[PDB]
């Protein structure tokens, strides 16, 4: 037995804390590094000597995706030669080494390592459609930081942590643990909230210290190094005296893993088996659909939030309170809602809560934005305007999708990898979480920009986003529903 109120409030045995608290620390370190790196790259590329920030979009398009595929191929290669632990260390140490060499060797030696300006005539030797490659190669080290800062969350959190969790957690145990790991994300959000503001405060020396980004960057980067080394120590501890405890991983199944399976294929062989598996393309669709929908339902919503609040002081107050309650709602949903929905209803319900909600409360949102004029005769007789009503309804879909990401979406999705063979639990996971996720947060910007030129104005593409969302949610719901048939079947094969 487990209990009556505890089987619903805290479904963790007291002995199986030694497996989950180290994973909480791992998630904490990863998310802390990710938040610090994001907020230091978006703050470091504003203040290069001269216009060293204009070459952000050239990076965003020409390096971010391409370097994501390069990392993905290199990871696929190293998965065949290195062990699981060796691969984890060999992916993590380059990040920490770059974060150590940046403030010591790389950033201070800007004017010496950036193109000896001689790569200035090289601008006008190449066709006038690759001026960015000159700007990218001119802001060379800053380019290496934006890629390694964007990739960190895609690499460490999605591929490395979850790929480690999905290798060391059973499905029934996943239903109880995976929802909880975003509490580490929220606690790391508090830690980063203190750390980043500490760095910004210490950015004060103007005269005796002329370099503003010397000391602050060195301390932020050393903080990321300390967090990454604590990450690696957590990995070592959980591999040395967690996967070795006989309580879990019953004795004879232990040496089935230190003597276990491993990705054994070739680069084109592996990326032709993954491209012709209906399972992986469905996971790719979920991540692509989630990437665009959450971005589209957020740019559509953070356009009414700008019409309702045309002054940043209260927009910061609403988004200061929204960012505070998306932490409270996403500590209760993680502790209480997420693990319970997946255990009393099933896998499918957990994967369909957030798209159905985004659908139902997105239908309401778009019906109050498209039909704004012929709705302020009824809504106006209830004490509110349809703009405020779309703000609140759109906040619910942005507080039941951001508070559902780690709890039900990232739980059910990374649970889906568990019954898989190694070639997609490791190498397909790279494509889904590093490459097939880049098209998510970039495909929502392309759809926005591609429709900001077909409609011209942001207010005219709302009827076109709605049909786009209704199709992506359609392909999301069918992908989630068709995936459930494969998951519940492939899971059944694991009881051989």
């Amino acid at each position, epitope marked *: 037995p487990f209990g009556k109120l505890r089987s619903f409030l805290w479904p963790i045995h007291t002995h199986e804390l030694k497996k989950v608290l180290p994973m909480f620390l791992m998630f904490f370190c990863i998310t802390f590094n990710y938040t610090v790196l994001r907020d230091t790259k978006d703050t470091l590329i504003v203040g290069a000597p001269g216009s060293g920030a204009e070459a952000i979009p050239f990076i965003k398009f020409w390096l971010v995706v391409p370097c994501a595929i390069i990392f993905m191929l290199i990871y696929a290669k190293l998965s065949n030669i290195l062990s699981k632990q060796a691969l984890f260390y060999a992916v993590g140490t380059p990040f920490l080494i770059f974060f150590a060499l940046f403030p010591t060797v790389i950033y201070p030696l800007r004017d010496v390592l950036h193109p000896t300006e001689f790569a200035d005539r090289l601008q006008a030797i190449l066709p006038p459609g690759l001026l960015g490659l000159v700007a990218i190669l001119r802001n060379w080290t800053f380019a290496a930081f934006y890629v390694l800062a964007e990739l960190w969350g895609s690499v460490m959190l999605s591929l490395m942590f979850w790929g480690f969790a999905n290798e060391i957690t059973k499905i029934h145990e996943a239903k109880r643990f995976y929802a909880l790991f975003g509490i580490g994300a929220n606690i790391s959000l508090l830690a980063s909230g203190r750390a980043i503001v500490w760095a910004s405060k210490l950015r004060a020396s103007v005269s005796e210290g002329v370099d503003p980004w010397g000391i602050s960057l060195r301390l932020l980067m050393a903080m990321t190094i300390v967090s990454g080394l604590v990450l690696m120590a957590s990995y070592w501890w959980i591999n040395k005296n967690v996967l070795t405890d006989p309580r879990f991983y019953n004795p004879e199944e232990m040496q089935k893993g230190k003597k276990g399976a491993k990705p054994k294929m070739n680069m084109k062989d592996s990326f032709l088996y993954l491209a012709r598996s209906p399972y992986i393309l469905l996971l790719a669709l979920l991540v692509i659909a989630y990437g665009i929908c959450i971005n589209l339902i957020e740019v559509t919503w953070k356009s009414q939030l700008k019409l309702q609040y045309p002054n940043m002081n209260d927009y910061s107050e609403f988004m200061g309170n929204f960012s505070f309650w998306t932490g409270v709602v996403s500590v209760l949903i993680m502790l209480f809602v997420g693990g319970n929905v997946i255990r009393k209803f099933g896998w499918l319900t957990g994967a369909l809560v957030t798209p159905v909600m985004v659908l139902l409360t997105g239908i309401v949102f778009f019906a109050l934005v498209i039909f704004r*004029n*012929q709705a*302020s*005769g*009824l809504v*106006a*007789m*209830f*004490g*509110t*305007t349809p703009l405020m009503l779309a703000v609140v309804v759109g906040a619910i879909q942005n507080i039941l999708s951001k508070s559902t990401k780690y709890a039900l979406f990232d739980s059910t999705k990374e649970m889906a990898y568990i019954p898989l063979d190694q070639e997609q639990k490791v190498k397909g996971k790279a494509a889904i979480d590093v490459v097939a996720a880049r098209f998510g947060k970039s495909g929502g910007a392309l759809i926005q920009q591609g429709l900001l030129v077909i409609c011209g104005s942001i207010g005219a593409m709302t009827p076109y986003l709605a049909v786009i969302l209704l199709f992506i949610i359609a392909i999301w719901l069918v992908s989630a529903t068709k995936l459930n048939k494969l998951f519940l079947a492939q899971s059944a094969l694991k009881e051989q």
Partner: nanobody
Amino acid sequence: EVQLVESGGGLVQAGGSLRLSCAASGFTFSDTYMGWFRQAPGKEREFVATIDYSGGHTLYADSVKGRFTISRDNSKNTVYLQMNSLNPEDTAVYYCAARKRYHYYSYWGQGTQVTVSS
């Protein structure tokens, strides 16, 4: 039965004023949600003012903010509407409105003609 007798209509110069009225009978005015719409000939109907169950919440349309002030008195049961600084596009049939405490539709009114001249 639930008739809403309007009043106050007439011709007034630009920058003038006229004050509507909506006699309410057939329900509990103290717990009935009031308002005022308007429908110019040719264009659809838009809401112009709104007053809550207890006179506290006053929601207006962005085209009549500051100029029009809705006010209701439960004793002398009427959802008044004080219009000031009238501009020519306020020419319409200013419908009264009424909603019960848990109903989702509105008992409309006959309609008062407010032609603001130029």
